[PDB]
Amino acid sequence: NLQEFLGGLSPGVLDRLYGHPATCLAVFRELPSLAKNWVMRMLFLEQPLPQAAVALWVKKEFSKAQEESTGLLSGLRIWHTQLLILNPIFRQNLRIALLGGVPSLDKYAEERWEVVLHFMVGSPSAAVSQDLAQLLSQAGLMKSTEPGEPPCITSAGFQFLLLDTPAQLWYFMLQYLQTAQSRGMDLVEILSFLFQLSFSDSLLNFLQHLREFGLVFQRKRKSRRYYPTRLAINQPGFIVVETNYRLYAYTESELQIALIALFSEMLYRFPNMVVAQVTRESVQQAIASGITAQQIIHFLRTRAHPVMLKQTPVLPPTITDQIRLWELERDRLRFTEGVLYNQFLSQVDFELLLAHARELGVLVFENSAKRLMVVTPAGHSDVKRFWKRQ
Amino acid sequence: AKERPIWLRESTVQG
Amino acid sequence: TKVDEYGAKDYRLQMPLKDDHTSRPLWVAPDGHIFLEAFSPVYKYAQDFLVAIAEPVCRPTHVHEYKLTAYSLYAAVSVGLQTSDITEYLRKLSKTGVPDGIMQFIKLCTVSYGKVKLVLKHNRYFVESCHPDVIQHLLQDPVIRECRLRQTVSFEVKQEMIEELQKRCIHLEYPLLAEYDFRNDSVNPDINIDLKPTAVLRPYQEKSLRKMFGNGRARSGVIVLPCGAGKSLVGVTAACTVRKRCLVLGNSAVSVEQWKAQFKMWSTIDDSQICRFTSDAKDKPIGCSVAISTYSMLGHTTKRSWEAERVMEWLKTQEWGLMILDEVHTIPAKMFRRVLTIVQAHCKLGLTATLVREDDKIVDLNFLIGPKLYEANWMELQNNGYIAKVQCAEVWCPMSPEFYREYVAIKTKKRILLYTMNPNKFRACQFLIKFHERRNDKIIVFADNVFALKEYAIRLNKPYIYGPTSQGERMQILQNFKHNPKINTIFISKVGDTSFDLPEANVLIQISSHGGSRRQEAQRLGRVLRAKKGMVAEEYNAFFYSLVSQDTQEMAYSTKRQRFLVDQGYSFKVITKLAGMEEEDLAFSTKEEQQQLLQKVLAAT
Amino acid sequence: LNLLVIVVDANPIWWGKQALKESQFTLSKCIDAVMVLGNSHLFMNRSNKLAVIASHIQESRFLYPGSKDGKYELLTSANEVIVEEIKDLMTKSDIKGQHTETLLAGSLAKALCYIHRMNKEVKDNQEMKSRILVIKAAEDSALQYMNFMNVIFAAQKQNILIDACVLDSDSGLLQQACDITGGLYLKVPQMPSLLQYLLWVFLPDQDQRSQLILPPPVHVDYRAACFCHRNLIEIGYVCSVCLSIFCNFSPICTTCETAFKIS
DNA sequence: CAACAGCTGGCCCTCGCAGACAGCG
DNA sequence: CGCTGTCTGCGAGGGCCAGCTGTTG
Numbered sequence A: 001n002l003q004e005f006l007g008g009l010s011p012g013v014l015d016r017l018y019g020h021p022a023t024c025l026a027v028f029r030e031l032p033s034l035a036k037n038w039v040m041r042m043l044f045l046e047q048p049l050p051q052a053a054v055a056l057w058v059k060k061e062f063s064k065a066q067e068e069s070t071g072l073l074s075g076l077r078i079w080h081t082q083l084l085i086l087n088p089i090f091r092q093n094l095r096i097a098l099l100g101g102v103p104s105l106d107k108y109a110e111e112r113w114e115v116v117l118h119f120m121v122g123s124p125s126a127a128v129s130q131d132l133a134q135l136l137s138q139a140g141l142m143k144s145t146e147p148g149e150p151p152c153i154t155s156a157g158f159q160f161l162l163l164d165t166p167a168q169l170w171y172f173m174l175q176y177l178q179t180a181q182s183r184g185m186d187l188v189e190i191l192s193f194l195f196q197l198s199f200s201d202s203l204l205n206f207l208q209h210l211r212e213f214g215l216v217f218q219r220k221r222k223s224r225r226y227y228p229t230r231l232a233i234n235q236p237g238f239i240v241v242e243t244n245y246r247l248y249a250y251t252e253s254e255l256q257i258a259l260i261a262l263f264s265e266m267l268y269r270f271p272n273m274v275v276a277q278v279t280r281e282s283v284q285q286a287i288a289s290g291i292t293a294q295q296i297i298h299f300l301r302t303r304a305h306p307v308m309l310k311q312t313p314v315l316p317p318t319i320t321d322q323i324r325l326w327e328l329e330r331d332r333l334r335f336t337e338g339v340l341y342n343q344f345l346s347q348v349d350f351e352l353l354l355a356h357a358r359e360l361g362v363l364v365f366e367n368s369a370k371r372l373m374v375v376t377p378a379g380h381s382d383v384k385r386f387w388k389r390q
Numbered sequence B: 001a002k003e004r005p006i007w008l009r010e011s012t013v014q015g
Numbered sequence C: 001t002k003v004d005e006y007g008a009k010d011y012r013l014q015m016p017l018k019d020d021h022t023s024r025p026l027w028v029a030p031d032g033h034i035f036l037e038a039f040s041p042v043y044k045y046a047q048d049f050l051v052a053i054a055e056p057v058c059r060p061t062h063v064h065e066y067k068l069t070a071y072s073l074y075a076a077v078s079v080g081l082q083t084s085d086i087t088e089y090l091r092k093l094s095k096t097g098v099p100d101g102i103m104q105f106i107k108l109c110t111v112s113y114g115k116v117k118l119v120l121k122h123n124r125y126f127v128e129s130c131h132p133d134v135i136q137h138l139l140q141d142p143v144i145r146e147c148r149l150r151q152t153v154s155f156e157v158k159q160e161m162i163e164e165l166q167k168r169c170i171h172l173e174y175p176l177l178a179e180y181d182f183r184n185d186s187v188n189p190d191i192n193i194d195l196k197p198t199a200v201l202r203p204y205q206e207k208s209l210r211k212m213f214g215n216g217r218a219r220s221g222v223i224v225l226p227c228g229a230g231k232s233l234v235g236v237t238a239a240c241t242v243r244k245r246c247l248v249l250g251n252s253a254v255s256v257e258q259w260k261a262q263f264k265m266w267s268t269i270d271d272s273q274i275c276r277f278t279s280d281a282k283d284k285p286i287g288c289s290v291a292i293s294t295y296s297m298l299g300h301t302t303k304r305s306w307e308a309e310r311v312m313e314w315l316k317t318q319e320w321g322l323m324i325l326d327e328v329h330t331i332p333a334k335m336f337r338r339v340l341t342i343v344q345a346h347c348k349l350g351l352t353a354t355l356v357r358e359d360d361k362i363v364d365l366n367f368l369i370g371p372k373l374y375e376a377n378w379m380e381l382q383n384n385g386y387i388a389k390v391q392c393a394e395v396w397c398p399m400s401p402e403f404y405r406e407y408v409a410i411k412t413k414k415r416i417l418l419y420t421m422n423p424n425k426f427r428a429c430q431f432l433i434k435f436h437e438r439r440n441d442k443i444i445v446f447a448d449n450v451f452a453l454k455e456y457a458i459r460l461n462k463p464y465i466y467g468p469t470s471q472g473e474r475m476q477i478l479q480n481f482k483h484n485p486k487i488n489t490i491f492i493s494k495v496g497d498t499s500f501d502l503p504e505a506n507v508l509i510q511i512s513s514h515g516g517s518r519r520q521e522a523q524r525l526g527r528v529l530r531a532k533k534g535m536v537a538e539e540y541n542a543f544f545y546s547l548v549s550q551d552t553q554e555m556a557y558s559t560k561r562q563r564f565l566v567d568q569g570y571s572f573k574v575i576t577k578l579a580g581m582e583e584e585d586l587a588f589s590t591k592e593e594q595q596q597l598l599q600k601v602l603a604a605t
Numbered sequence D: 001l002n003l004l005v006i007v008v009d010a011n012p013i014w015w016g017k018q019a020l021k022e023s024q025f026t027l028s029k030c031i032d033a034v035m036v037l038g039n040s041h042l043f044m045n046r047s048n049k050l051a052v053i054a055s056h057i058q059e060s061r062f063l064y065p066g067s068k069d070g071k072y073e074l075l076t077s078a079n080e081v082i083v084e085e086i087k088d089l090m091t092k093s094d095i096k097g098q099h100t101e102t103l104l105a106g107s108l109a110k111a112l113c114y115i116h117r118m119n120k121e122v123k124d125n126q127e128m129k130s131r132i133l134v135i136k137a138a139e140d141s142a143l144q145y146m147n148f149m150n151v152i153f154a155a156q157k158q159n160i161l162i163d164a165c166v167l168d169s170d171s172g173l174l175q176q177a178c179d180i181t182g183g184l185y186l187k188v189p190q191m192p193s194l195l196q197y198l199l200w201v202f203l204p205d206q207d208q209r210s211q212l213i214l215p216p217p218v219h220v221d222y223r224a225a226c227f228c229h230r231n232l233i234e235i236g237y238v239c240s241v242c243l244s245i246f247c248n249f250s251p252i253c254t255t256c257e258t259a260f261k262i263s
Numbered sequence E: 001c002a003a004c005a006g007c008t009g010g011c012c013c014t015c016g017c018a019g020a021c022a023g024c025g
Numbered sequence F: 001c002g003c004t005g006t007c008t009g010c011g012a013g014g015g016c017c018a019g020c021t022g023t024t025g
């Protein structure tokens, strides 16, 4: 999540991020319910207050909310104990925010995002861009190994495909932000823009990337002014699932058919319907490719035709159950590397070694009756050294 | 009033 | 025939999209497959037309699928439809239009009906037609001339070669219309069979007969209804309409008795007229207006006994206006098909519930009896309350390690006994019977392997029925099971998978089966599919359990034999484990018991 | 979401007396405190909406239905409309010596119907929790008790809070209102520090007010007085027609004219 | 050379029929 | 000493699965 991302940042970058007022408002908005009040309280105050007082302002009931919000803001480093005054920059910058100091767009965003997904799968008709190709490949969801040949999709790439467009886009931006620092792009500049969007050379490159994903659109030959799309700030289903492992996809887009074809066999193609059968051969292939069963049920669940919505569960339980069993069937044998110790002549010392292995956290399985245990090879030397020491 | 058994009523799959 | 990248039959270059496709619920691919939507406002009208022209392939609760076959179309013209009517309505229903290939295909298989007719009179079979040209074309055919007896033109044909004549007639695109004009047949005396007013036929029952009697004449064909739908009443009603001597061919001695009782219950025919022809006894078949028998008795090939031979002589030398053939799907067997020629019948009505077979001979019913007149939708009847709602399940019983050690190694056909006699499977059956009996449910247990049936019967101390059991003894058990509260669970074998009427049997269990016999599974589930007294439409009145052994060949057969039921919308929930089993005092709780059982199974060989 | 409504009592006579007194507290600061209080509320979340209402001896008018200073653009518009609207109302006004007491029930009546008008408009998906942050700044009017009493019940029926924040005089009638409808009450004695009371006591919404420690409710004296005298009476006599609290036994109550029969 | 039909053998069970043996008069 | 019912083999058949040839790319 967005708040998750801010927490995983250094104090130096955070204070830099708390620049123009719009950022402080953006970070303020995500304060869950309580801390928003606390921010307003100690906003006009220039003198730190005791930590005990904050604790006693929340009734015993719903006390857990008092601590969790406090921990969240401590992570955000909004205030400091100073022994709980807010950051002088945040207080000042926030005070600036607090009285101080269309239909075409959505279609464009949906289409431009789709072509990226088209490229993700082996779709010959997809947008081609060297920067985009290396972006996805370096994003951890694609791999080429040969610049001349088009890249394939990694194990995580297939899972990314099934995720809903909101989470599908957000995960991509989250990966984009992390790699921005590695490639030499300042994280604060891009991160600050995203917040300001919700309402320089680095931005110009960043804006071009955002234009490529379809989140932003200048419409005026790349003018200074841009018009963000709906997805930039941050739909009815079409699949009918039958009890006999049949999917009737009411799809006109080639991408959705490509998605459904990942984990099912396509039988017939009609302009507003495609007949797909969820055969165990396909699903096992989909699971082998990297997909997780929960995603398949979720992917079919979210794109559920309205007719199935009235039924509960919308997906017939046997289909959902059967898909899971197909997943669990593959992993019947849980392979786990380890080192086995037998011929435990020292029965008394076997327990001592057992206790030592447990303390180190290396032991995986043990059998007291047979006086044997298995330890991962990583810790094999440690136990081997312990045995040699005697 | 003679409700269905647990196994038939709700899924028994671990997942 | 264009194939997409995802092995999909691309049909976008073949047909266009209709502008008002939202109202139109039908798809029609050039392959003939027709995908109808069950949630469309106009479903009811489309289904009746579609089921007639195309036999359903799968009918889930949301989107049905049908297939167009020459035999499927030939049924449409017989009932009363015409090529112009079918194609025009099909185009009206089609939301994408009918491809040129299918449009010509429908026309091709509609200019063949009525060209040639088969008429039986005075114990003689004649090939009747009003067009001499088509008759002349048939005479050119060698086998047609071979089977010949050795304006309207008719040439007599020997009875023994009726089958070959009929089979070639279809192959010559000239189906024989074996249509009986009972109302204009005074040669055969009218029987006193009459439908008592207390008997009212349900809408599907009447609709099926409407197709049979669309015109004044009576049509001969196969009428398919779900198990427990009441095919006995429809068969009785057909005899009432014909009012001629009626021959009923059940499947076993149990079938005829239930046929006898149903006639008395649903007809005014006196007990004297009703007669049976079975090895157990006979109610003077020489004098009887309605004869009830079994394929085994009539189809017996070896020399018949004097008692049976006398009846057989009378049966051959008779004229029957209506020959009801219960369990039609067994007709295409090598010998059971001969019973059609042995007996002389004008109109052959076929009643069955599972028009499926693991061979390709099920299509032979088109000419052996006639086109599939009707096929009710199981879910439609299930929601209407005419048949009890069943919560099918598949209890996954893990295989015992001692057994699986032997099963994996052994491959000389001894596996069937090994995973049929699974102690884990036995415990699930033992627990299920105990729990369901405590719920006042009438349990039925099936087992193809008699060895397994006997092993479970004595161990649980429950009655068991199979081949050797005398007709009276097995009949006694059913009566006890039907009425006696003490007998709450019964064990049955392959004998009682068909024609057993147990209306109060809420629960069913299956511990064995004969391979992937979809007919066996759908028939076996039929016993408990009968409507219950205090039945509620959406309360899952009945239940079905198919115990299987995990990681075993029975898994492959379990999926294979569920194909027919799922095609009708039944969902087979998987039960990996059963709760409450551990806290139950069930058998084979010790390795010594399981070890003893395994040795016995190996000994049986 | 929440629909806050700040029914400010901008009484020129009282606020004007402060100007003549040349005290530190002044109306301009009060509107700023309301302004900052208003900005913070919307600032909490996008879905929130607010409204501001003034009061005068004549009539009460709504004060509310790029980023030059750098603040949020939306808040910029609210400040402009409120700043200009209040000045017009204060500067322009007639003179009526007979009527000099501030009116608040009428202003509230404009507030209660606004939520209902706004409650209809809001879509069915989103449930709204409206509130009225009445900020009294002058003594109540005797003749307005009945009119004010009807609006309060309308609020209770529709579940709108009245978080009275009276100052410089404890309004016995207003403190009654906040109790009936579940609203908070607070008599701030440090007028210059008025805003900090608002951000603490009044700013948090109802769904969050419960999970918070706030000043305890003040005792409300539900006094009843006879219509003869207007003196507190513990045992009251009423008739089934007037429903009027009366001083002592009378053969017939004047307001009724009923032919009461002795017994 | 590799790959897919294809009818029959085999197995399981079931049925009708005949023969012998036991209960009854 | 005869007649009828029970039980046990002979012979055949249904349904399905699996196999060694026959045939086609």
Ligand SMILES: Nc1ncnc2c1ncn2[C@@H]1O[C@H](COP(=O)(O)OP(=O)(O)O)[C@@H](O)[C@H]1O
Pocket: C200, C201, C202, C225, C226, C227, C228, C229, C230, C231, C232, C233, C258, C262, C499, C500, C501, C503, C530, C531
């Ligand atoms: N119209 C009806 N009214 C009442 N009971 C009916 C009707 N039709 C059928 N039944 C009952 O349903 C059951 C049908 O059994 P049966 O005729 O053997 O079914 P099928 O031949 O379809 O397997 C019996 O209990 C019968 O009495």
Ligand code: BEF
Pocket: C226, C227, C228, C229, C231, C352, C353, C498, C499, C500, C526, C527
């Ligand atoms: F379909 Be039934 F059981 F004769």
Ligand SMILES: [Mg+2]
Pocket: C231, C232, C326, C499
């Ligand atoms: Mg029947």
Ligand SMILES: [Zn+2]
Pocket: D226, D227, D228, D229, D246, D247, D248
């Ligand atoms: Zn008085």
Ligand SMILES: [Zn+2]
Pocket: D239, D240, D241, D242, D243, D244, D253, D255, D256, D257, D258
């Ligand atoms: Zn009065």
